[PDB]
Write a protein that binds this ligand. Structure first.
Ligand SMILES: NC1=N[C@@]2(c3cccc(-c4cncc(Cl)c4)c3)CCCC[C@H]2O1
Ligand code: NI
Length: 402
């Protein structure tokens, strides 16, 4: 029940993602790799870039094989492209195994790498369905499971910062654990509650109810999952569908109304500050997301604090003060349970049993009045289906799946 060698194997800078050290090639070349449950490609910088201190040198690897195939991956806010191949991959502070995995060698990118994030690649931990160029490119975790005896499960403890902050010139350092192949009981307290993975593509889940300070938002529950809800270590914020975001902000504004913040704050474009150590946490409400349980008609709630959704940023010009960014934001692609949610909890990606576990994280940030919580069961007599069915494009329909 112990996985000591994998504890504290994640690092990062606040808001710039959590990375794990990996080696690629023979002999092993060290790279820091973003841990991303919201994508499904293993892709690494493989050429010089202003924001890279180092990169994967295919030519230096005796075990590298070229797949003679390129890949082009555009996102909303950036893009990367490169050449597909395979090589030997290991996680030094992970299981004592080495696997031959697909690797996209990133040769050109725009707005993908981040200055000072200290990572050089991305480890997509989601399913084949959303891999590029297509679902025939086996993701890393699938290879790991197929080639080794590693159980088909991983778990994440993301630990946020962290006031008072160490530094004024750089962003706050963060830490965490990625436990590959099991569950480490020292990383959580209390009960572990499981929600079904609705479909294996993203880690998609269903939210059945939302409360802000114990007040039901009272929307049709399909609105909470429009057009999907996913658990995503590669997103910083809690992102909410437009209508849900508007209702949440209205509610949080109402609770915190003793303080009149500029509109820029609610848009996540401006910091708000209090004198060191005087932040009035109690005027900001807790937020509860009820997730579908394993049993029909059951749910459980995960409850986060303002300490999760107000992100600390130490401004140089006002290091006298504790300043915060509002880290709930609008989505047009459904709910994204990012680091804002995940930093509250130990999260178990139980692929073997098509479910996601949540328990209170032994490292979550709290005060003496309130804690992040995982609580259940809650039962509802006559349950609506809260899942949304994405309109089927002819594009998507025409695909064959041999
Ligand atoms: N899930 C997730 N991963 C990204 C991505 C790409 C590059 C950088 C990041 C990233 C940047 N800053 C902070 C984080 Cl946590 C991730 C994320 C790739 C897939 C779609 C958009 C992003 O959503
Ligand atoms: Ni066919």
């Amino acid at each position: 029940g112990s996985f000591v060698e994998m504890v504290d194997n994640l690092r990062g800078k606040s808001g710039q993602g959590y990375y794990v050290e990996m080696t690629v090639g023979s002999p092993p070349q060290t790279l820091n790799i973003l841990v991303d449950t919201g994508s499904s490609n293993f892709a690494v910088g493989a050429a010089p870039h202003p924001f890279l201190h180092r990169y994967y040198q295919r030519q230096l690897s005796s075990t590298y094989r070229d797949l003679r195939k390129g890949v082009y991956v555009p996102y909303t806010q950036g893009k990367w492209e490169g050449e597909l191949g395979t090589d030997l991959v290991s996680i030094p502070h992970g299981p004592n195994v080495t696997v031959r995995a697909n690797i996209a060698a990133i040769t050109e990118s725009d707005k993908f790498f981040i200055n000072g994030s200290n990572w050089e690649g991305i480890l997509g931990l989601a399913y084949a369905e959303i891999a590029r160029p297509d679902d025939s490119l086996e993701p890393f975790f699938d290879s790991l499971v197929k080639q080794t005896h590693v159980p088909n499960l991983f778990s994440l403890q993301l630990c946020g910062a962290g006031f008072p902050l160490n530094q004024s010139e750089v962003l706050a350092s963060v830490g965490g654990s990625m436990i590959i192949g099991g569950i480490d009981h020292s990383l959580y307290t209390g009960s572990l509650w499981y929600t079904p993975i609705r479909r294996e593509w993203y880690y998609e889940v269903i939210i059945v109810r939302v409360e802000i300070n114990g007040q039901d938002l009272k929307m049709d529950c399909k609105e909470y999952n429009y057009d999907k809800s996913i658990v995503d270590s590669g997103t910083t914020n809690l992102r909410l569908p437009k209508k849900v975001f508007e209702a949440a902000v209205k509610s949080i504004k109402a609770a915190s109304s003793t303080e009149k913040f500029p509109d820029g704050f609610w848009l996540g474009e401006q910091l708000v500050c209090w004198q060191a150590g005087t932040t009035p946490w109690n005027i900001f409400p807790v937020i509860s997301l009820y997730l579908m349980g394993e049993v029909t008609n059951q749910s459980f709630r995960i409850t986060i604090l303002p300490q999760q959704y107000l992100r600390p940023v130490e401004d140089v010009a006002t290091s006298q003060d504790d300043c915060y960014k509002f880290a709930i934001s609008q989505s047009s692609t459904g709910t994204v349970m990012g680091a804002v949610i995940m930093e509250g909890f130990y999260v178990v990606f139980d692929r073997a049993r098509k479910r996601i576990g949540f328990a209170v994280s032994a490292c979550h940030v709290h005060d003496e009045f309130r804690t992040a919580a995982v609580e259940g069961p809650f039962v509802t007599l006559d349950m609506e289906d809260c899942g949304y069915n994405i309109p089927q494009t002819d594009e998507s329909r025409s695909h064959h799946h041999h």
